[PDB]
Amino acid sequence: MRLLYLHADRFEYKTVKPALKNPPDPPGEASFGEALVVFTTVEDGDGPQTVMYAASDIASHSSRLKVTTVILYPYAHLSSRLAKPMAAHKRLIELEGALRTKFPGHVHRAPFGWYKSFSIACKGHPLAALSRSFTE
Amino acid sequence: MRLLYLHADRFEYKTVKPALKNPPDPPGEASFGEALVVFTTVEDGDGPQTVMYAASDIASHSSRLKVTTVILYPYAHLSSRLAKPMAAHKRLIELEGALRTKFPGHVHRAPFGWYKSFSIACKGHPLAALSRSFTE
Ligand SMILES: C[C@@H](O)[C@H](N)C(=O)N[C@H]1[C@@H](O)[C@H](n2cnc3c(N)ncnc32)O[C@@H]1CO
Ligand SMILES: C[C@@H](O)[C@H](N)C(=O)N[C@H]1[C@@H](O)[C@H](n2cnc3c(N)ncnc32)O[C@@H]1CO
Ligand SMILES: [Cl-]
Ligand SMILES: [Cl-]
Ligand SMILES: [Mg+2]
Ligand SMILES: [Mg+2]
Fold first, then answer.
1. Pocket mutation for ligand 2, best pick of B75, B77, B86, B120 (most atoms within 8 Å of C-beta)
2. Which of A128, B65, B108, B124 could form a disulfide with A7 if both were Cys (CB 3.0 to 4.6 A apart)?
């Protein structure tokens, strides 16, 4: 699993065209204020332990930043060892569930399988942009 | 070298605090309209051939998108095999020079060595977000 943690003053996205033959999530859009935006690339061989490590770390970092909103944003481009789309969607659903057991704030999982537009006002402070890897 | 190509309707950044003891570039800010924003992570062992491949590819993709502006945005977080900061700055300067020999539009190299805020209105079309790797 490869993640990019962006501490945003605002974030918003909108699904555009379907990227997969049949996106497993419906289309949509959302916007937010201060949040940790987590761009999330599921890698081959991510499993239950990977998901647990990521959930704990996301919760911890959110705690450090004193953010009370986390956006889980599926992203195919953070690495070159991607899991297949169905396994990736399953892991993202697990990640959302796991995060909710560790982080008391708002958790939004953005839709999987779409091309999406977004904008972000990414803060510029020292912890506003960090990358993470998780394995098992 | 690892790159993320984002086709933006707008982009803007502002240096915040210095990330390095002595950033080799002065502080600043800029904004833009439609552009290809290239987040750029220089990796260990990038050399002259890597720079040439990246310049050619950036030019080609820009040509496909019919963009006439390219932003070279130094980014430490796209991979886990970073070059050292001085070698990375040198390669980015080379990349900017090389790109100008292949791409007829505006080339902006953002400052190196700073924490930076940014916002982007990333388009949602199928080619609006792509990743690349170059080696030699
Ligand atoms: C493209 C850009 O605009 C958009 N934001 C996009 O990335 N869309 C992706 C993810 O939603 C998802 N996806 C497929 N595989 C993966 C994976 N292994 N990990 C995470 N997401 C995946 O399927 C879409 C196509 O790759
Ligand atoms: C942090 C985030 O806000 C900001 N945007 C940032 O990334 N700042 C980076 C790059 O400008 C640069 N830098 C250092 N090494 C590299 C490298 N190998 N490749 C590219 N840039 C590098 O040095 C700064 C600290 O890593
Ligand atoms: Cl980690
Ligand atoms: Cl390539
Ligand atoms: Mg819509
Ligand atoms: Mg300033």
1. B75
2. A128
